[PDB]
């Protein structure tokens, strides 16, 4: 049974897309099929921000961010609950979950 | 400009007049009927210097073709080798007006 119109990936007129490496394991995944996270976080997270702020030698020091991009095979993505299975008609929508918080 | 000079040579040897070969190009230069001389890049240095000296004496232009005698001949459309050739009558081609 043809489960997805596009075969779980984004290859339309290529024929070949280069493979990348998963981050959790080392599974070799085509680049367009992999699930890609782009997390942007501070170095200190939420509770130490006050501690370094008072201990800083500078006045009003803007704490740096940490930009790391993640790649996931389907197995790790399901097992880490970054993505979960949905109902058959709910599979068709492809707007990302809300980004308010 | 190699493509364009190939085109001009094809037209010149379709319509105008020419001589192929060192010992006959020398005769044409000495008689003064040679309008242009063309030399392949692998002709002997002694004779190319000789041809340059004759052309300087006779006030004639010389062109150093950018290929050896085999494809100079093929550009001429002949099935043999030419090292130096002389255009005597440009005909309906702008080889002199380069």
């Amino acid at each position: 049974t043809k489960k997805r119109r596009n075969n779980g990936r984004a290859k339309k007129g290529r024929g070949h897309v280069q493979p990348i490496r998963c981050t959790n394991c080392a599974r070799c995944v085509p680049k367009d099929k992999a699930i890609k996270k782009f997390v942007i976080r501070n170095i200190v997270e939420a509770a130490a921000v006050r501690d370094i702020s008072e201990a800083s030698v500078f006045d009003a020091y803007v704490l740096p961010k940490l930009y790391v991009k993640l790649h996931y095979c389907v197995s790790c993505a399901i097992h880490s609950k970054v993505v979960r299975n949905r109902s058959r008609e709910a599979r068709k929508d492809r707007t990302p979950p809300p980004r308010f918080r | 400009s190699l493509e364009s000079i190939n085109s001009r040579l094809q037209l010149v040897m379709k319509s105008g007049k020419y001589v192929l070969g060192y010992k006959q190009s020398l005769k044409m230069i000495r008689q003064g009927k040679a309008k242009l001389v063309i030399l392949a890049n692998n002709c002997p240095a002694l004779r190319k210097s000789e041809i340059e000296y004759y052309a300087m004496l006779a006030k004639t232009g010389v062109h150093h073709y950018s290929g050896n005698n085999i494809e100079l001949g093929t550009a001429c459309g002949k099935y043999y080798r030419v090292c130096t050739l002389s255009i005597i009558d440009p005909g309906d081609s702008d080889i002199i007006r380069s």
């Binding site: - | 692998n42 050896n68 005698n69 085999i70 080798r81």
Partner: protein
């Protein structure tokens, strides 16, 4: 007419020395007995006199070259690299 199926110049060795040795000597034999075109006159009169020595029958010009080929890819790449090195040295 065509007198042999696989063996060419190495047909003179008969059934000796092994199929693989005959195959790997065939191409070298062809290369060393071929006639090459002279870059100095345009005629195909280049013969291997001795190993490493090539001669033109018309120019009477002698060139130092490969053992079985007129020139080797190592020689040509060295020549190109040396030209580039001189170009860089004189800027």
């Amino acid at each position: 007419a065509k007198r042999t199926k696989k063996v060419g110049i190495v047909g003179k060795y008969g059934t000796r020395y092994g199929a693989s040795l005959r195959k790997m000597v065939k191409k070298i034999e062809i290369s060393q007995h071929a006639k090459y075109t002279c870059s100095f006159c345009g005629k195909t009169k280049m013969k291997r006199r001795a190993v490493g020595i090539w001669h033109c029958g018309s120019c009477m010009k002698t060139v130092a070259g490969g053992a079985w080929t007129y020139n080797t890819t190592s020689a040509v790449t060295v020549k190109s690299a040396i030209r580039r090195l001189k170009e860089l040295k004189d800027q």
